[PDB]
Design a protein around this ligand. Structure first.
Ligand code: GLP
Ligand code: MG
Ligand code: MG
Ligand code: MG
Ligand code: MG
Length: 90
RNA sequence: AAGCGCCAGAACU
RNA sequence: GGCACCAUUGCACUCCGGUGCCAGUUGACGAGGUGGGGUUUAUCGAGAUUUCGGCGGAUGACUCCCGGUUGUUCAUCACAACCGCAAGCUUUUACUUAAAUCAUUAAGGUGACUUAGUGGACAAAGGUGAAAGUGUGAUGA
């Protein structure tokens, strides 16, 4: 079911936190207001990102339009996030 | 304006 | 913090795989101190994760040398203890802005941390200027 946060994986894990953040912002801010982008390079979480849209409608067009889009040489996979970001529940 | 300077170990990022 | 490799396709919201290599960062808080040669593990305390470990300095210490003080004028020689522009020993007296830690709040840095301000303390050694005692003989004016 649709969500404010879209889950992105298959991201190039050689890209550092700061850069991948901004690049993601560069690519995804046309869909709507991005509240935060969450990114970590740990064993569990590397190659993955959470983009938190203010409006779900924006998240939907994001997932739809950028699905499989080559980014740092790898086509990204995008999913509606399992749970809400706590910052969206708050 | 000399318990002062440096930084190869160590620890920390 | 960064890079290569190995491994990882992983659904999170206080960071969080391993190895190697590079980078960065921490690494002494003040007080005190220099005649020359030598030797050597270079004085005082405050603090308390490294103020540890390594390297390099260094005014210390001991000893030798040289030049001087005191041992009641004043030379000369030894003797006893000192001094390096000070100067026997006992033995009281004030002076010699401690600084950091600690607390606190700004700036910078991705970060480890860094710089600076603010607040209040608390030393020891050595030294310096007073004060009371108790330290030579030989020869010559
Ligand atoms: N004042 C100190 C000395 O007392 C100390 O001996 C010397 C070497 O210190 P360390 O051996 O700890 O490096 O440094 C300073 O000069
Ligand atoms: Mg210092
Ligand atoms: Mg000093
Ligand atoms: Mg040391
Ligand atoms: Mg040393």
């Amino acid at each position: 079911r649709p969500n404010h946060t879209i889950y992105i994986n298959n991201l190039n894990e050689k890209i550092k936190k700061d850069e991948l953040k901004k690049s993601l912002h560069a690519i995804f801010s046309r869909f709507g207001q991005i509240l935060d982008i969450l990114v970590s390079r740990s064993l569990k979480m590397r190659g993955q990102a959470f983009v938190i849209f203010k409006e779900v409608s924006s998240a939907t067009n994001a997932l739809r339009s950028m699905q499989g889009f080559p980014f740092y040489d790898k086509p990204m996979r995008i999913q509606y996030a399992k749970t809400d970001s706590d910052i969206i529940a708050k």
